[PDB]
Amino acid sequence: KKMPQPKTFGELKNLPLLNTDKPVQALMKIADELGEIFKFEAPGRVTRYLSSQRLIKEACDESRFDKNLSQAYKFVRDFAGDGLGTSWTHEKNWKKAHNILLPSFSQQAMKGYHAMMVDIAVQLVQKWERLNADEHIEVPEDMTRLTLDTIGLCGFNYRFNSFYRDQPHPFITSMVRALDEAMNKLQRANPDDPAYDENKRQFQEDIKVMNDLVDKIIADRKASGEQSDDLLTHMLNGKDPETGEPLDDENIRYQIITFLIAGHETTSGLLSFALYFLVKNPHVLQKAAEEAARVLVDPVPSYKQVKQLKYVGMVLNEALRLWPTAPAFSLYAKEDTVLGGEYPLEKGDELMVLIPQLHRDKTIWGDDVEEFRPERFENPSAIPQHAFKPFGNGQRACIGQQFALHEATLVLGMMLKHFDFEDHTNYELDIKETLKLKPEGFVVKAKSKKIPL
Numbered sequence: 486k487k488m489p490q491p492k493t494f495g496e497l498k499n500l501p502l503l504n505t506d507k508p509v510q511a512l513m514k515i516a517d518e519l520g521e522i523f524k525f526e527a528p529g530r531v532t533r534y535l536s537s538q539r540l541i542k543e544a545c546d547e548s549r550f551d552k553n554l555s556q557a558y559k560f561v562r563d564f565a566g567d568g569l570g571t572s573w574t575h576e577k578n579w580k581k582a583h584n585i586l587l588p589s590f591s592q593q594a595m596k597g598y599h600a601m602m603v604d605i606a607v608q609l610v611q612k613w614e615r616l617n618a619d620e621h622i623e624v625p626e627d628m629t630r631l632t633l634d635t636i637g638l639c640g641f642n643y644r645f646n647s648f649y650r651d652q653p654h655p656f657i658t659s660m661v662r663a664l665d666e667a668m669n670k671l672q673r674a675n676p677d678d679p680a681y682d683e684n685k686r687q688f689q690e691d692i693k694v695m696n697d698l699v700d701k702i703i704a705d706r707k708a709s710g711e712q713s714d715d716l717l718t719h720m721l722n723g724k725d726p727e728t729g730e731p732l733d734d735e736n737i738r739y740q741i742i743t744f745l746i747a748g749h750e751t752t753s754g755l756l757s758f759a760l761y762f763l764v765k766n767p768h769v770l771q772k773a774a775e776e777a778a779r780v781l782v783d784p785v786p787s788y789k790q791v792k793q794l795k796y797v798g799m800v801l802n803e804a805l806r807l808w809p810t811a812p813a814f815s816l817y818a819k820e821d822t823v824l825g826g827e828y829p830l831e832k833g834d835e836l837m838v839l840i841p842q843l844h845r846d847k848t849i850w851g852d853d854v855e856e857f858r859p860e861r862f863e864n865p866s867a868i869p870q871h872a873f874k875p876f877g878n879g880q881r882a883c884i885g886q887q888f889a890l891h892e893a894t895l896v897l898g899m900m901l902k903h904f905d906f907e908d909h910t911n912y913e914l915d916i917k918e919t920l921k922l923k924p925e926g927f928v929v930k931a932k933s934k935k936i937p938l
């Protein structure tokens with residue numbers, strides 16, 4: 486069986502297809518016309534994009550495939566180091582950090598972070614309470630303020646104070662430039678070219694900004710001895726049950742940088758896509774608003790109250806079905822194997838899981854796959870294995886899934902409790918692609934229900 490392949494550009498093969506502002510969306514269109522699998526070649530590089538549950542069910546077999554670092558995350562590693570997201574499974578510090586960090590990311594551990602998530606959520610609500618009549622809300626911009634600040638507070642008890650400023654904290658500024666520089670290197674034909682020599686100076690400066698701040702807070706915390714409810718405390722007190730060793734101060738720094746990279750843009754995008762689908766689907770918004778009002782009976786939401794926001798949780802999952810904000814992940818074959826009984830792979834062959842296309846597999850979801858219907862998730866046990874993968878797969882799945890969903894349910898719950906929303910511009914969906922997806926330019930007007938918090 487020979488594999489489909491999109492149009493080629495002579496000696497560049499398929500690489501110019503990714504020289505665009507919206508690569509994932511272009512890859513989705515390629516998948517529409519070529520089907521569940523297609524070969525994608527580049528100068529000295531070959532991968533295969535998978536879109537169907539039948540094949541991705543096999544790619545998620547951990548005995549046959551392990552996480553691969555895409556070229557994007559190899560560049561990100563220049564400042565995320567061997568934190569969890571940019572380390573290979575076989576690296577000593579992956580398993581060690583995984584064993585140490587896993588209990589601090591459980592559903593149960595969310596009880597400890599709850600109060601500090603509420604702290605930033607109340608700031609978001611009060612900001613919107615304090616808008617004048619004419620004014621509107623820049624949704625992704627404000628959601629990103631919240632998620633950066635929430636990860637800052639719960640990650641290492643640091644306040645970026647994003648709601649007090651127009652230009653973000655220098656760390657946030659340096660991190661976004663670093664991610665941006667790592668992204669631009671993907672489509673950069675000439676290395677070492679002097680036009681980017683300043684890009685390299687800025688990169689090294691941005692790395693130092695990030696490292697200086699994180700190393701100082703770690704050092705300050707070690708001298709202090711203070712015990713807080715943050716991940717930094719757990720990392721300073723944790724030991725790997727396997728090796729018996731703790732994480733050293735450098736890898737702890739890479740973990741903190743990792744949480745901010747991995748968590749802030751994905752969770753921001755989810756809240757923004759969720760609010761977008763709600764205003765485009767007023768019957769769903771009303772149903773979710775009715776739940777928010779019924780459950781959140783106190784001025785400040787409790788951890789137990791957030792767990793009762795079931796429909797809000799279904800809204801978040803349906804937003805993740807349509808636009809998973811971390812839209813692709815890479816795998817490699819551990820040994821020679823046959824995929825789907827018709828595609829032979831050699832040891833080391835790479836695969837890409839195109840999550841937005843998986844989530845549109847009509848044989849799983851039916852024919853209305855493009856419709857926003859959270860009720861698709863009223864009985865999750867009916868969904869076949871590996872059909873819904875917004876948080877990746879296996880031991881290399883998202884360690885922050887419970888943190889992300891608890892924050893998003895908390896924040897969207899309070900939003901629906903406190904405001905009615907207006908799609909005052911009839912916003913047309915425009916999905917900007919960094920390494921993550923978000924709706925660009927999405928704006929709304931909020932009218933307060935005047936409920937004290």
Ligand code: HEM
Binds near residue numbers: 570749809880886888
């Ligand atoms: C809100 C939506 C989020 C989505 C959709 C998401 C998505 C993902 C995905 C798809 C992966 C697997 C990547 C791969 O296979 O290469 C991953 C891994 C990871 N995520 Fe998340 N994420 C979210 C939020 C967060 C948050 C809040 C945190 C931390 C506070 C976080 C931290 C991580 C880390 C550390 C890993 C690497 C795990 C490992 O390999 O050991 N993410 N995430």
